[PDB]
Amino acid sequence: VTFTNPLAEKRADPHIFKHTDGYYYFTATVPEYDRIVLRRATTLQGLATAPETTIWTKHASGVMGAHIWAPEIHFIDGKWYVYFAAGSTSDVWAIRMYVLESGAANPLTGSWTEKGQIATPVSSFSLDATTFVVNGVRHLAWAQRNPAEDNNTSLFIAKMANPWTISGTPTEISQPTLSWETVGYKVNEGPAVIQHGGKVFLTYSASATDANYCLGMLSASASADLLNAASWTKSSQPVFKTSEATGQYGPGHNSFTVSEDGKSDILVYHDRNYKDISGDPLNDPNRRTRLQKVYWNADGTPNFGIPVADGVTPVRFSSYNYPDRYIRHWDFRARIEANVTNLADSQFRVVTGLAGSGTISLESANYPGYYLRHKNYEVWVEKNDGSSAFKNDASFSRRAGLADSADGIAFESYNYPGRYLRHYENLLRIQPVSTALDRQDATFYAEK
Numbered sequence: 268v269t270f271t272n273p274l275a276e277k278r279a280d281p282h283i284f285k286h287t288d289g290y291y292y293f294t295a296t297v298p299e300y301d302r303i304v305l306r307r308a309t310t311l312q313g314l315a316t317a318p319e320t321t322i323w324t325k326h327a328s329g330v331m332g333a334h335i336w337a338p339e340i341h342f343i344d345g346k347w348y349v350y351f352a353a354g355s356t357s358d359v360w361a362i363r364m365y366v367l368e369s370g371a372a373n374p375l376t377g378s379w380t381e382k383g384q385i386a387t388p389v390s391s392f393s394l395d396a397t398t399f400v401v402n403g404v405r406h407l408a409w410a411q412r413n414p415a416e417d418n419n420t421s422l423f424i425a426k427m428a429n430p431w432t433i434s435g436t437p438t439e440i441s442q443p444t445l446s447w448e449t450v451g452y453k454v455n456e457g458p459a460v461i462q463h464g465g466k467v468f469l470t471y472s473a474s475a476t477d478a479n480y481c482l483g484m485l486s487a488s489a490s491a492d493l494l495n496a497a498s499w500t501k502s503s504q505p506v507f508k509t510s511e512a513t514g515q516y517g518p519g520h521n522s523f524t525v526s527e528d529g530k531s532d533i534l535v536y537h538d539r540n541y542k543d544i545s546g547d548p549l550n551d552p553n554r555r556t557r558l559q560k561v562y563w564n565a566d567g568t569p570n571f572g573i574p575v576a577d578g579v580t581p582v583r584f585s586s587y588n589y590p591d592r593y594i595r596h597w598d599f600r601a602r603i604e605a606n607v608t609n610l611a612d613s614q615f616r617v618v619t620g621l622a623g624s625g626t627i628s629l630e631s632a633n634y635p636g637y638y639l640r641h642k643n644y645e646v647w648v649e650k651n652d653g654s655s656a657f658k659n660d661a662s663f664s665r666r667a668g669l670a671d672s673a674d675g676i677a678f679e680s681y682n683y684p685g686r687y688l689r690h691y692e693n694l695l696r697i698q699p700v701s702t703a704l705d706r707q708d709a710t711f712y713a714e715k
């Protein structure tokens with residue numbers, strides 16, 4: 268259920284589609300911007316080592332012959348469709364949207380038919396076509412220049428007549444006007460749609476593709492007219508952005524997939540592990556593809572948290588007797604609490620114990636190098652200073668749950684044996700367990 272990031276080096280604008288043939292299909296922008304690659308695997312982690320087939324290469328002359336950008340693969344009405352953007356050999360900045368089609372069972376080995384340009388009423392810079400279905404009605408969303416606006420691209424949506432043709436007229440549903448949307452360039456690009464609880468959430472990327480790259484989001488009700496701009500409300504702050512603490516910079520151009528069991532939504536995105544671009548921004552090849560689980564807030568909105576540290580993804584721990592309440596820190600004091608808005612406060616990664624002897628330690632996701640540790644029997648999230656005292660205070664023996672020895676987890680203090688991590692008045696402590704309540708207070712679940 269956890270992932271190891273990054274999923275793929277030197278792959279930007281990642282798109283993963285989970286098909287009914289029990290495979291995931293992964294396409295992405297390559298640094299040479301010259302072809303469309305594809306890989307498949309039965310699991311998300313499998314993708315990291317799956318070999319890439321080149322399914323289509325740029326034309327030698329004319330259209331579809333430059334800047335092959337941001338492919339997406341979809342299965343629609345028994346056929347495969349690939350959406351991408353391309354300029355021409357003559358005008359490399361006349362980027363337009365194109366579609367490929369294959370009828371083959373396996374798209375990696377099939378042959379592809381070019382269905383041509385997705386025509387729009389305005390002849391202007393267009394890219395990042397995505398398709399999605401709301402109440403059985405297929406839509407296209409994309410980024411395009413509105414020439415009467417002083418910016419790079421705005422977001423558009425339209426109904427579709429077929430997978431390569433819009434129906435009716437587009438609606439512009441967002442334009443880059445907030446300060447975090449306008450750093451370097453005034454950009455709204457990379458639309459991506461996830462549906463949950465009767466709402467449509469359309470994330471998109473904003474600002475220059477540097478450390479300022481981030482995700483904003485539009486929200487609408489699935490029952491509303493998606494072609495009425497008034498149905499969409501823009502989030503006033505980014506929903507996903509650079510985290511210096513975790514060394515993740517300019518996360519963006521995302522897509523959405525689902526876990527192996529189909530139970531969890533997965534955020535698929537790119538970023539860099541450094542802040543400042545060297546050379547022509549466009550020529551920096553180092554963006555990499557990453558995966559993390561999407562968590563749903565009580566109000567029904569998605570919570571993407573922060574881009575997590577490289578390596579294994581962190582987990583959340585819920586209480587046995589208060590199954591809605593999660594271990595989280597606030598002012599560095601550990602507690603249990605429901606409906607954690609600052610998600611990363613409730614994410615921890617399980618690492619080999621700082622004090623050895625087969626113990627475990629719980630590293631903070633938003634404060635790497637900080638760990639759950641006790642002091643005077645109270646539990647805090649504090650920075651490891653390298654002292655023996657800290658390492659002892661931050662190490663625990665994993666035990667079978669005290670109220671659930673099958674599925675539950677308990678955490679026995681390494682330096683105070685017989686004292687367990689337990690909540691009391693919602694604050695976390697290390698205390699002995701004698702009573703039935705004590706045992707419940709000391710039992711937790713990871714990602715249940």
Ligand SMILES: [N-]=[N+]=N[C@@H]1O[C@@H](CO)[C@H](O)[C@H]1O
Binds near residue numbers: 419
């Ligand atoms: N110059 N320029 N345009 C850049 O390239 C476009 C695609 O990312 C974005 O609008 C912007 O970052």
Ligand SMILES: [N-]=[N+]=N[C@@H]1O[C@@H](CO)[C@H](O)[C@H]1O
Binds near residue numbers: 597599600609612633
């Ligand atoms: N103040 N404040 N912020 C809280 O304190 C930080 C440390 O626990 C948490 O990340 C944050 O939610």
Ligand SMILES: [N-]=[N+]=N[C@@H]1O[C@@H](CO)[C@H](O)[C@H]1O
Binds near residue numbers: 642643660682683
């Ligand atoms: N007692 N005492 N000392 C303090 O409390 C112990 C238990 O939290 C810690 O090891 C130490 O910080």
Ligand SMILES: [N-]=[N+]=N[C@@H]1O[C@@H](CO)[C@H](O)[C@H]1O
Binds near residue numbers: 690691692694704
């Ligand atoms: N309040 N109170 N009682 C304590 O607080 C509850 C929540 O921490 C614990 O289950 C219980 O031990």
Ligand SMILES: [Cl-]
Binds near residue numbers: 606607608609
């Ligand atoms: Cl919160």
Ligand code: NA
Binds near residue numbers: 282396458
């Ligand atoms: Na996309």
